[PDB]
Design a protein around this ligand. Structure first.
Ligand SMILES: [Zn+2]
Ligand SMILES: [Zn+2]
Ligand SMILES: [Zn+2]
Length: 276
């Protein structure tokens, strides 16, 4: 399918390169040029009309690294906002508008710790699992029992309605990851760990085969986007799976903001209640 909306760097709403633009650059001499050079070429070839048989439209301004287009990812975004001359309604984007993006830098233990602590210490300089702080995720969504649309605290799979107490399956809608804590994690009960025929010594493949949490596979990594963050699975401890926001955004006050379709006003309005 044609990806119409892009950032000013010609990357899509998920933060990744479009196959059509990648091929367009490759057909010219330019797949290994810098992003700046590639964008100069695209601007010289009618910008959003460069593909000829379909149109693009710039919805976002992003600051990115200068890596070649084919190597651009959401982890190469430094900041994101609405494009100054885009006057339409912003579609869903991987990061909230008017935000700065932080990427977790991998750590190397001088002395590899075994088990879960070695896995988490490749992410955070923590001495114990309890130094990790669980995030508070929420989604603005309808409750099937009381029909109200409200902010339901959730994990990746289940949300709870604050009006009536009903658990609801998480569906697409405005999402936030709350404030970004130090040593940020999202903890969920691990089905593989709970199954006696599999159990806590399971593999990473075992985790994803039984979690029921869909991921995107790309260049050997698996991620799930939610609420302005890009999450990856780290490992399990005491039968809970730990995910970390390998990328997170900050709209102000350390808050991850709101992502989703038609959330521009919501995300702006949220900033106002973070301070006085
Ligand atoms: Zn195209
Ligand atoms: Zn309800
Ligand atoms: Zn597990």
């Amino acid at each position: 399918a044609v990806t119409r909306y892009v950032d000013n760097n010609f990357c899509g709403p998920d933060g990744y390169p479009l196959d059509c633009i990648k091929d367009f650059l490759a057909r010219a001499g330019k797949s290994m040029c810098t992003l700046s050079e590639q964008l100069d070429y695209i601007e010289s070839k009618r910008g959003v009309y460069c593909c000829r048989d379909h149109d693009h439209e710039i919805a976002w301004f992003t600051e990115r690294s200068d890596k070649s287009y084919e190597h651009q990812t959401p982890f190469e975004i430094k900041s994101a906002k609405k494009f100054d001359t885009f006057k339409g309604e912003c579609p869903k984007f991987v990061f909230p508008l008017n935000s700065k993006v932080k990427v977790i830098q991998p750590r190397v233990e001088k002395k590899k710790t075994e088990g879960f602590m070695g896995r988490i210490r490749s992410v955070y300089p923590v001495a114990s699992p309890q130094e990790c702080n669980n995030m508070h995720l929420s989604t603005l969504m309808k409750c099937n029992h009381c029909d109200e649309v409200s902010w339901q605290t959730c994990d990746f799979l289940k949300a709870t309605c604050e009006h009536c107490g009903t658990e609801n399956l998480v569906i697409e809608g405005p999402t936030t990851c709350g404030y970004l804590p130090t040593n940020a994690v999202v903890k969920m009960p691990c089905p593989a760990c709970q199954d006696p025929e599999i159990g806590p010594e399971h593999s990473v493949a075992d985790y994803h085969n039984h979690s029921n949490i869909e991921t995107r596979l790309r260049k050997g990594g698996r991620t799930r986007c939610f609420g302005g963050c890009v999450f990856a699975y780290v490992g399990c401890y005491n039968k809970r799976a730990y995910w970390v926001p390998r990328a997170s955004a900050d709209i102000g006050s350390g808050h991850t903001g709101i992502t989703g379709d038609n959330v521009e006003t919501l995300n702006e309005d949220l900033l106002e209640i973070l301070s006085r």
